[PDB]
Design a protein around this ligand. Structure first.
Ligand SMILES: Nc1nc2c(ncn2[C@@H]2O[C@H](COP(=O)(O)OP(=O)(O)OP(=O)(O)O)[C@@H](O)[C@H]2O)c(=O)[nH]1
Ligand SMILES: [Mg+2]
Ligand SMILES: [Mg+2]
Ligand SMILES: [Mg+2]
Ligand SMILES: [Mg+2]
Ligand SMILES: [Mg+2]
Ligand SMILES: [Mg+2]
Ligand SMILES: [Mg+2]
Ligand SMILES: [Mg+2]
Ligand SMILES: [Mg+2]
Ligand SMILES: [Mg+2]
Ligand SMILES: [Mg+2]
Ligand SMILES: [Mg+2]
Ligand SMILES: [Mg+2]
Ligand SMILES: [Mg+2]
Ligand SMILES: [Mg+2]
Ligand SMILES: [Mg+2]
Ligand SMILES: [Mg+2]
Ligand SMILES: [Mg+2]
Ligand SMILES: [Mg+2]
Ligand SMILES: [Mg+2]
Ligand SMILES: [Mg+2]
Ligand SMILES: [Mg+2]
Ligand SMILES: [Mg+2]
Ligand SMILES: [Mg+2]
Ligand SMILES: [Mg+2]
Ligand SMILES: [Mg+2]
Ligand SMILES: [Mg+2]
Ligand SMILES: [Mg+2]
Ligand SMILES: [Mg+2]
Lengths: 148, 117, 190, 16, 95, 166, 97, 243
RNA sequence: GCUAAACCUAGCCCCAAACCCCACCUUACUACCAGACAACCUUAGCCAAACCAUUUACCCAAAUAAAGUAUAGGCGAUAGAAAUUGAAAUGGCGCAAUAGAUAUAGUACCGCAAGGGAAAGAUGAAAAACAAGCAUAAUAUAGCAAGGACUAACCCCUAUACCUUCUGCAAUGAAUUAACUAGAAAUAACUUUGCAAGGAGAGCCAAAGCUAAGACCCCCGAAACCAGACGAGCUACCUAAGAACAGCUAAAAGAGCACACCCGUCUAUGUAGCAAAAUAGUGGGAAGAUUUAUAGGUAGAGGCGACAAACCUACCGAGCCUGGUGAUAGCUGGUUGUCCAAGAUAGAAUCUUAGUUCAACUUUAAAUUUGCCCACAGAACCCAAAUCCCCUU
RNA sequence: ACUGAACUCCUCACACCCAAUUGGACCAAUCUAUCACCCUAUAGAAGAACUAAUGUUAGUAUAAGUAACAUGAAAACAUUCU
RNA sequence: UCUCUUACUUUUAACCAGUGAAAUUGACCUGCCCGUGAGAGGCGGGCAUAACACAGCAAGACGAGAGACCCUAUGGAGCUUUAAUUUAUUAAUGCAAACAACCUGCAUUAAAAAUUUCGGUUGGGGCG
């Protein structure tokens, strides 16, 4: 603990205290960096690379419509509605090597991702899900056990 | 300063020592001049019986046979004192058989008990 | 450790009876300064850093780690020649002497852990034989554990128990990351 | 002024 | 700060930090320059341009802010049109 | 507490061979819990150390200290038991081989002082121990003679070695 | 003199009493029983620390939360004081900050 | 150790044990049930959800009632759910100023009220809120019979309620005797509030008063065992004779 | 060989389960007379904010999660939800007489009271069987008491006790023995596993992550503040009803001298005392505003006061006890096994200079490649010493 | 010239002399698992180590057998005397 | 009282007998001169030096147990204020309320108080 002093006694000031000089984190002005952060909508990215990888490994079946439930079941994406996740957004990454004909339903979709999906002969639709519906979609079995 | 010793009439000043007693039951009252009037009826009169010719003794011979204790009960007393007459009169107003509705009017009331011992 | 709940507890200087008033003034008495007769320094005082309340030692290794431990225990027994497979646990008689003599003749260890598929179907003969034995312990398949496997010198398994253990442990391999507790319904999980 | 402190009386009353 | 709250036993976040600093998931902390809204009439254009900029924090400052904020603020946030999405990660960084 | 002194009288030696010197008798006696300071008793014990029983009794009979009477009683009891039980032929043929005083079990009392302060008196008790050995008292150690001193010095001189060398 | 002058009575431990012999059985109840029961459900002890762990402050908070209403008067007072003291200690004292 | 039950359930357990158990079921239910009194000293929120201006998001809102202190003098009067507000204020209404204890008391008036059912005039210390409530109820009798226990919040008010309810239940001819038509008119006017007398007897009784009433009801001097044994012996003899 | 030393169970701790004759409110423990008074009412403060003044977590009616999120806040210290989700159900890696309950006991003892509050016992199947301190044994020129030694105890030579606080010794603490007596934890990081673009037994994290484990955060001490009790048997004053005041001089006296009585001017004794304010002498008053016994009253953000800030149960510029309370203390003191290793003075801000934060220095682990020394050449006019830079080596 | 260190050489062996701090290797005793069975091993734990707080309790020292204390005289122990 | 002290008696005292504390105490096998140190029994150079008792003394052991002075603390408390913040409380008025008064609410003015503080440098003090 060192020699006698406030720290050795174990009563040093709180974290961020600077001995009386105005603390750094209080002398920096307030700015709305995180204003409304808990209300901003979040969409988990689902790159075409990831989608093609899932289809290739058979964790997602392109012979049937692909929606958030199928993605979650195949573990292609993790959705956290409690953390303001509003669904999945298609991402153009991997577009040049996407060669799957799929019927995928997402929440957001980039122009290039839509172009790749449609060029491969598939169909893509952007569908909205409120937080409650999104939670039910992502984890249907617990909802069924809720008995509602 | 002594909290544990019992509080008796030997402890306080003159007034305390005179006022407190030793549990002896009162015999009368005090009139003017501190003259004590003793009421005869307040004095317990010992109803001592005539023991002449009595056969019992403080002790019982060990030769007496052993018996089983049977504490008397209200039902047993009723059976041994009331049931005979009740049965006889029924075969042939409960006051006639011994029942007394109100203890009031008796010298020896059973409740609230108004006699000694 | 995970089941452990140490019930040891001691009274701190706040909980020791009395000790409110200052024993003597700060200065004048020529004695050491004190604030109560129940500080840790005093006889009968509190304990400065003693055990506090019932303490849990609960923690969970990953279920994959625990299944791997079970697999490793089984492999260790097999490689060290302490694992014996049985067609069934049926015994000619429920006499514990028969079981002890059989173990001694076959050169099993002083301690044997017999395992059967389920509790309900375990033969009455073996049940009676092992109920009266201390070093011969009979458990259902669901009760198999590394601790008992290591405590008992030899491990005896039935063929259904072998199949059950293989299925259950191999399932941990090649399973998805859970979406929710496996107690809940799954497409292919009984 | 600091008053004198008497020790407990039992400590000086024990007998064989 | 409060290392163990009295109701949950959790570590609390100093909201004065949240109201002032942005954390990039890479670990950098961004801030405004103090006095960027003060007495601009007596500040030269270069000084005003310097003050109007978003600025990174020191290593020790970033460590202090990380200590003062909890893990919830140090997660991945996939906001829709975040202006700092590109800045949330580092590229071509050697040691 | 320890009571080994009393037990010391119960040791039985094996019979002596005819061609062996007669073992002098030894009698251990003591008095416990004497209301007297062991420091004060030590002086009487030291005084009577090494003296014959009769000489010790004579010296104690004319000593003003309270402990003298107690020691005299103890010595008389020791003499009586030596004659009766330890097969000592002559009463007077005994000398005090050992005599010591030991601390007894003491009691603590309070001594009131002037200003509400106090001290801790100790009601001091002491033990007294004696060993009586049969036979005339051993002669006192003669004082060192000049001849003996010179002999010792010359022995020390002869004992010299060439130190720290081959 | 703080040492005993005689050997203490021999301590005989039955390593094969039922408790030791069956110790640990059903620890794998979850992974070997289709996860019907969690292993922590095998824990027997205070209601407020079954399948849970924390430092002294967290333990005291949980105890007050879960059985505080059922606690005796002076025990609850001591628990409240302990929570207060532990809050002050953990949130205001220590080498690191 | 730990109590088997939470300390806050001890009153309910005591109610389920003893003479309180023997108390009539309807009275026990009335005691057990608790309803929030009508807001008096605070303005309730209109809806359960509100769009908070700060972040413009929908948030749940709750109506947390202001604690009210009712001095015993209130129990002798009819305060329309009004009482003393024992709270605190910020000097000059700014939180950066001193905090001061503040007691807001209601303005009490002495007024005379006539009860049609009771055919009596009562002088009652009353509040303007109580007068307004009486006007809204169209009379003291209607106000007393309508206002529940929590809103009435007056032992005298509950006693008046019990008296009126008992009068209605019994159809007592003591109401305007020699004027049966007027009595019937009053009873018809207040018909809707009539309830069985067995229930009206227990309206507005405190727990202690109900316990005392039950004790008085169920107190009986023990029957002498002479009567019981005579009846038993006579019955036994009847059976013996018949068989 | 004395004092002593030794013991194992009396019991206790944490959980689970389970809901639990007579007398006595008057002076309590008092057989026996005309009632009437009856209860409810925000806690505060310490403390944190390094002052403090708004503010500062606290039996709440399901654990977990949402979440330390929304929000609140000298927008600062800090405080902090809800919607929503919905788990389960037999003792001890506790103490063993300075421990564990204070407990052999709320007893003894202490206090007027509220309150405070101990200590200790050890045979046997049967009782109808080795600490300190001393002694044995006082001591020999000279010296931190030992070491090198030596034939030899000493003699010879060498040697400035320990801890802590300072730049350094002086200063602090220690009679000594036994027992007891003081580092509690998150953020991340590091190591070791598991699995791996996925990890985790819901929630959470994830651009190699994730899960789990290991591993870091002391003790004693104020004057204080506030809440509620208890105190006017001392003392201050007062109320009721009492009592005392010899003798002489004067005469109806807040008169004089002087007993008892009250007080306490000066000296001496005493100073752990006879005494926690006394004794002897000397002295002031001693029929008055006197002294005094009895009962009652005034109670602490108060009482009472011929103001001395005096007295209010020996310690009153704000009593005592209990509680908040383990108050707080940037201050003092302490902070216990062995061994090795690296390891020293640059400033800045600060109600700040007895402190802290940053820097600098120091330590550990890791990545990479240049680091130091330094040849020329080079670094200002106004008008010494050296320093920086720097290829080689 | 010689004497003269823990400098240097010599035979052998080497981690074995810095405050605060920091890294590391071991470890007494206790309990638990399993060993062991005249007192141990591998691990898991923790009220886990005292030459020092005018530290707490108990014992005994030092001062010290010191300061201090006490019982008028004779006697027939009747009594008398001061 | 003193020049100028003396004699005696009692207590005390010292010896014998009984009983038997307290402060204090790191260990002490505990010397003097000079020097060093800013102050020496313990360090350096010299000198002295068998061992212990008993009674005195008060030069040293910065003698022991309790004392004052200066400075510090973002430590208290008492007191005063034209220090800051308040009027919670009382007393007044005014306006509402209600039928002049009382009560309640809101204001204003006083009295009484309540909480808290009293920065830094400049030997102190005054003015600076
Ligand atoms: N954890 C715990 N278990 C206890 C406690 N007291 C008793 N038990 C358990 O109670 C069970 C039954 O106790 P027993 O005394 O054998 O039987 P019992 O008298 O029928 O038991 P109860 O009905 O509980 O009184 C056993 O498993 C005990 O270990 C206790 O204080 N704590
Ligand atoms: Mg420091
Ligand atoms: Mg306490
Ligand atoms: Mg204890
Ligand atoms: Mg006294
Ligand atoms: Mg503060
Ligand atoms: Mg005890
Ligand atoms: Mg010894
Ligand atoms: Mg000392
Ligand atoms: Mg008085
Ligand atoms: Mg006169
Ligand atoms: Mg006069
Ligand atoms: Mg004055
Ligand atoms: Mg003055
Ligand atoms: Mg006092
Ligand atoms: Mg402290
Ligand atoms: Mg080194
Ligand atoms: Mg400042
Ligand atoms: Mg400071
Ligand atoms: Mg040399
Ligand atoms: Mg310890
Ligand atoms: Mg020790
Ligand atoms: Mg000590
Ligand atoms: Mg002595
Ligand atoms: Mg002396
Ligand atoms: Mg003397
Ligand atoms: Mg003497
Ligand atoms: Mg000198
Ligand atoms: Mg002398
Ligand atoms: Mg000295």
């Amino acid at each position: 603990r060192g020699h006698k002093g406030e720290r050795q006694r174990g009563t040093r000031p709180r974290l961020g205290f600077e001995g009386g000089q105005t603390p750094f984190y209080i002398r920096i002005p307030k700015y709305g960096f995180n204003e409304g952060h808990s209300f901003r909508r979040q969409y988990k990215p689902l790159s075409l690379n990831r989608l093609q990888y899932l289809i290739d490994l058979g964790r997602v079946d392109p012979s049937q419509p692909i929606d958030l439930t199928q993605l979650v079941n195949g573990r292609g994406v993790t959705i956290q509605p409690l953390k303001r996740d509003y669904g999945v957004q298609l991402v153009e990454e991997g577009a040049d090597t996407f060669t799957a004909k799929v019927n995928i339903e997402v929440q957001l979709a980039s122009e290039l991702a839509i172009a790749a999906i449609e060029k491969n002969g598939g169909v893509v639709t952007t569908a909205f899900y409120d937080p409650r519906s999104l939670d039910i979609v992502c984890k249907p079995v617990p909802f069924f056990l809720r008995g509602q | 300063a002594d909290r544990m010793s019992k509080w008796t009439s030997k402890r306080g000043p003159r007034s305390f020592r005179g006022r407190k007693g030793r549990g002896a039951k009162g015999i009368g009252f005090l009139t003017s001049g501190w003259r004590f009037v003793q009421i005869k009826e307040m004095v317990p009169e010992f109803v001592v019986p005539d023991l002449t010719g009595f056969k019992l003794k403080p002790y019982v011979s060990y030769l007496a046979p052993e018996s089983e204790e049977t504490p008397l009960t209200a039902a047993q007393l009723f059976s041994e004192a009331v049931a005979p007459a009740i049965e006889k009169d029924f075969k042939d107003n409960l006051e006639k058989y011994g029942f007394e509705p109100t203890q009031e009017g008796k010298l020896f009331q059973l409740y609230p008990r108004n006699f000694l011992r | 450790n995970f089941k452990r709940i140490s019930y040891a507890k001691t009274k701190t200087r706040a909980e020791v009876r009395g000790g409110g008033r200052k024993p003597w003034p700060q200065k004048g008495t020529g004695r050491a300064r004190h604030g109560s007769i129940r500080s840790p320094l005093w006889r009968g005082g509190g304990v400065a850093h003693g055990p506090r309340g019932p303490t849990s030692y609960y923690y969970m290794l990953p279920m994959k780690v625990r299944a791997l431990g079970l697999k490793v225990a089984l492999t260790v027994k097999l490689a060290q020649d302490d694992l014996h497979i049985m067609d069934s646990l049926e015994l000619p008689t429920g006499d514990p002497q028969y079981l002890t003599e059989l173990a001694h003749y076959r050169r099993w260890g002083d301690s044997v852990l017999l395992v059967d598929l389920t509790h309900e179907e375990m033969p009455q003969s073996i049940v009676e034989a092992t109920s009266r034995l201390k070093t011969f312990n009979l458990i259902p398949a669901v009760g198999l554990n590394v601790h008992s496997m290591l405590k008992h010198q030899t491990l005896v398994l039935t063929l259904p128990t072998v199949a059950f253990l293989e299925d259950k442990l191999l399932w941990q391999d090649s399973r998805y990351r859970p979406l929710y507790p496996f107690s809940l319904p799954y497409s292919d999980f009984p | 002024f600091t008053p004198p402190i008497y020790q407990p009386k039992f400590k000086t009353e024990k007998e064989f | 700060l409060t290392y163990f709250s009295a109701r949950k036993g959790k570590r609390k976040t100093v909201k004065a930090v949240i109201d002032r600093f942005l954390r990039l998931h890479c670990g950098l902390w961004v801030r405004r320059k103090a006095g960027y809204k003060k007495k601009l009439w007596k500040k030269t254009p270069a000084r005003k341009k310097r003050l109007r900029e978003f600025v990174f924090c020191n290593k020790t400052q970033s460590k202090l802010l990380d200590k003062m904020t909890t893990s919830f603020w140090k997660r991945r946030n996939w906001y829709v049109d975040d202006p700092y999405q590109k800045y949330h990660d580092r590229t071509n960084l050697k040691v | 507490i320890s009571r080994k002194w009393e037990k010391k009288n119960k040791i039985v030696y094996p019979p002596q061979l005819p061609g062996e010197p007669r073992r002098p008798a030894e009698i251990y006696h003591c008095r416990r819990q004497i209301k007297y300071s062991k420091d004060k008793m030590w002086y009487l014990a030291k005084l009577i150390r090494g003296m014959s029983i009769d000489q010790a009794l004579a010296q104690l009979e004319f000593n003003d200290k309270k402990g003298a009477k107690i020691i005299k009683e103890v010595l008389l009891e020791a003499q009586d038991m030596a004659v009766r039980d330890h097969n000592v032929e002559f009463r007077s043929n005994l000398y005090i081989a050992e005599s010591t005083s030991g601390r007894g079990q003491c009691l603590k009392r309070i001594r009131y002082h002037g200003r509400g302060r106090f001290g801790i008196m100790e009601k001091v008790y002491c033990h007294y121990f004696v060993k009586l050995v049969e036979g005339p008292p051993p002669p006192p150690e003669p004082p060192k003679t000049a001849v003996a001193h010179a002999k010792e010095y010359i022995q020390q001189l002869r004992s010299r070695t060439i130190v720290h060398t081959l | 003199i703080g040492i005993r002058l005689t050997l203490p009575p021999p301590k005989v431990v039955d390593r094969w009493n039922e408790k030791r012999a069956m110790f640990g059985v059903y620890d794998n109840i979850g992974i070997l029983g289709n996860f019907e029961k969690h292993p922590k459900e095998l824990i027997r002890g205070p209601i407020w620390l079954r399948g849970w762990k924390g430092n002294e402050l967290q333990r005291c908070i949980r105890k007050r939360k879960m059985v505080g209403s059922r606690m005796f008067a002076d025990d609850l007072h001591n628990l409240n004081k302990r929570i207060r003291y532990l809050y002050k200690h953990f949130n205001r004292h220590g080498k690191f900050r | 150790p730990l109590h088997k039950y939470p300390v806050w359930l001890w009153k309910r357990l005591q109610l389920r044990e003893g003479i309180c158990s023997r108390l009539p079921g309807h009275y026990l239910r009335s005691l057990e049930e608790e309803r929030t009194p009508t807001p008096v000293h605070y303005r309730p929120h209109g809806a359960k959800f509100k769009i908070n201006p700060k972040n413009g998001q929908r948030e749940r809102v709750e109506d947390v009632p202001i604690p009210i202190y009712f001095p015993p003098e209130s129990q002798r009067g009819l305060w329309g759910g009004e009482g003393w507000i024992l709270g605190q204020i910020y000097a000059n209404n700014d939180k950066l100023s001193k905090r001061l204890k503040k007691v807001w008391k209601p303005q009490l008036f002495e007024r005379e009220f006539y009860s049609e059912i009771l055919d009596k005039k009562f002088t009652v210390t009353v509040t303007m809120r109580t007068l307004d409530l009486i006007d809204e109820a169209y009379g003291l009798d209607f106000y007393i019979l309508k206002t529940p226990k929590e809103d009435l919040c007056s032992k005298f008010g509950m006693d008046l309620k019990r008296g009126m309810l008992l009068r209605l239940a019994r159809q007592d001819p003591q109401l305007h005797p020699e004027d049966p038509e007027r009595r019937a008119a009053i009873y018809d006017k207040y018909k809707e509030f009539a309830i069985p007398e067995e229930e009206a007897e227990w309206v507005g009784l405190t727990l202690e008063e109900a316990i005392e009433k039950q004790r008085l009801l169920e107190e009986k001097d023990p029957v002498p065992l002479f009567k019981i044994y005579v009846a038993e012996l006579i019955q036994q003899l009847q059976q013996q004779a018949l068989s």
